[PDB]
From a paper:
The I-BAR domain protein IRSp53 is a key player in these processes, acting as a hub that integrates signaling cues from Rho-GTPases and phosphorylation pathways to initiate cytoskeleton and membrane remodeling events. In the inactive state, the SH3 domain binds intramolecularly to the CRIB-PR domain, resulting in a compact, closed conformation. Here, we show that phosphorylation of two pairs of sites within this region triggers the binding of 14-3-3 to IRSp53, which inhibits membrane binding and the interactions of Cdc42 with the CRIB-PR domain and cytoskeletal effectors with the SH3 domain. In all the structures, the phosphate group on the phosphorylated side chain engages a cluster of basic residues in 14-3-3θ, consisting of K49, R56, and R127, and additionally forms a hydrogen bond with the hydroxyl group of Y128.
Therefore, to study the binding of 14-3-3θ to the pT340/pT360 and pT340/pS366 pairs, we determined five crystal structures, allowing for direct comparisons of the structures of singly- vs. doubly-phosphorylated complexes. In contrast, the Sites 2,3 (pT340/pT360) and Sites 2,4 (pT340/pS366) peptides bound 14-3-3θ with ~0.5:1 stoichiometry (i.e., one peptide per 14-3-3θ dimer) and with more than two orders of magnitude higher affinities (Kd of 45 nM and 67 nM, respectively) than the corresponding singly-phosphorylated peptides. This result suggested that these doubly phosphorylated peptides occupy the two phospho-S/T-binding pockets of 14-3-3θ. Importantly, the structures of the singly-phosphorylated peptides display distinctive features that are recognizable in those of the doubly-phosphorylated peptides, for which the electron density is asymmetric in the two pockets of 14-3-3θ. Although the sequences surrounding pT340 and pT360 are closely related to each other, they are distinguishable by the presence of two large side chains in the Site 1 peptide, Y337, and R344, occupied by smaller side chains in the Site 2 peptide, E357, and S365, respectively. These distinctive features of the singly-phosphorylated peptides are clearly discernable in the structures of the doubly-phosphorylated peptides, in which each pocket of 14-3-3θ binds a different site in an asymmetric manner. We note, however, that the structure of the pT340/pT360 pair contains four complexes in the P1 unit cell, and only one of these complexes has a unique N- to C-terminal orientation of the doubly phosphorylated peptide, whereas the other three complexes appear to have a mixture of orientations. In the structures, ranging in resolution from 2.0 to 2.9 Å, the electron density maps revealed the phosphorylated residue and 3 to 5 residues N- and C-terminal to it, whereas the ends of the peptides and the flexible linkers between phosphorylation sites in the doubly-phosphorylated peptides were unresolved.
Author numbering:
A (entry chain C): 337 to 345, 357 to 365
B (entry chain B): 1 to 69, 73 to 230
C (entry chain A): 1 to 230
The structure:
């Protein structure tokens, strides 16, 4: 897609959020 | 809650990526009646951009899945309609804020340009999911807002100003995406870019960060649209 | 609606990253009463991990800002109240998950795989409660977490090869419980490294589909060991 403004946005365990 | 405490909570939510809370904070600030600094305008823009863009991405994913597709298709269309309803709700909220509080009581030409650009943005988001005469009218409103912002910005602002550049960026995207003319979108992005480069030695330091980035984005679009 | 439609809708939400709706779908599926398949357990796990991780991250950021500022300030009370809000909704999420585990899933689990899985989920979410609890509520949540983890760890030692990705994820999270909750780096490292080594020995005899997950989890074990050693 074409750019536009504005844009959107410890120990390791499982599962992990996406 | 009081404006200072309110925008404090807004920054707090921002750093916590709690964009719904941030958006309600900034809506309360706006509905208080007073105008917004550049930083507070940015807070409101970022908050509502995040909340609406979650649903924009969801809608694109779902419409894509629908194109490749059956009771399945019925469920897909109903879910897409749900997401569209949420998107229209958010866009109506933002546009109502713009009409009543922000655009009406804006002091500067720069703030007016910013709010008009934002109105163009959210009418464009509404048009991304529109059909029939509603689509025509939403495109009409988005283009009208962008064109007024563009005229005022080139009347009262220099080409290097970050607000003008961001307006050119999103208006070029509007031409490429909604009206579907690559040549005109390219010409708009490129004229903004070249006009900014023409001066540039006049740009003050405060804007160095924003302008530069925006200009890169311009060039990126022009690269993506020449392939 | 019957399972089929709920599963389609939950999967579509996962594709759209609408994790709230996914979680609602999978809660309905669970509450239908029947036993879940591996597909459905993965959907439930993914959905709820996603709905709780946002609250966990927000809480961590807010609490790093809280302890990073001066005391006896009015600015501070707002931050603390906000932290309490996020804590409240995180506790509500965890309570939902734990209720699903206590009323439906664990009780009717028929195979040891599902038992290990649900007990690991119980431990995970009681640990999520512990990381935000105080005093006696903290003691309660820690005890429940550790008990669930321990039951799963024994069941897994007795019923699973050391390469099974569920057993390895259990070991990872249990060592993390030892390091973060109990503040025991030595035993966290020992648990994680034991799982690691016992897995490495039997690795050549293993399935590719399981290879991806198992080697991922072992890599995570090694990374946690490197972080805890530093």
């Amino acid at each position: 897609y074409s750019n536009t403004l504005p844009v959107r946005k410890e120990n390791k365990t499982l599962p992990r959020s996406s | 809650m009081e404006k200072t405490e309110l925008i404090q909570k807004a920054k707090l939510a921002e750093q916590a990526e709690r964009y719904d809370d941030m958006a309600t904070c900034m809506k309360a600030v706006t509905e208080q009646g007073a105008e917004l600094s550049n930083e507070e305008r940015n807070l409101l823009s970022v908050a509502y951009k995040n909340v609406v863009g979650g649903r924009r991405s969801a809608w694109r994913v779902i419409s894509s899945i629908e194109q490749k597709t059956d009771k399945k298709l019925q469920l897909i269309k109903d879910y897409r309609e749900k997401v569209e309803s949420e998107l229209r709700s958010i866009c109506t909220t933002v546009l109502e804020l713009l009409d009543k509080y922000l655009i009406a009581n804006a002091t500067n030409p720069e703030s007016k340009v910013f709010y008009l650009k934002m109105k163009g943005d959210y009418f464009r988001y509404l048009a991304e999911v529109a059909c029939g005469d509603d689509r025509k009218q939403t495109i009409d409103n988005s283009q009208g807002a962008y064109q007024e912002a563009f005229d005022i910005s080139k009347k009262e602002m220099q080409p290097t100003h970050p607000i003008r550049l961001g307006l050119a960026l999103n208006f070029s995207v509007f031409y490429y995406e909604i009206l579907n003319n690559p040549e005109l979108a390219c010409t708009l992005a490129k004229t903004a870019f070249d006009e900014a480069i023409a001066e540039l030695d006049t740009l003050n330091e405060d804007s160095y960060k924003d302008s530069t980035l925006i200009m890169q984005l311009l060039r990126d679009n022009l690269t993506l649209w020449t392939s």
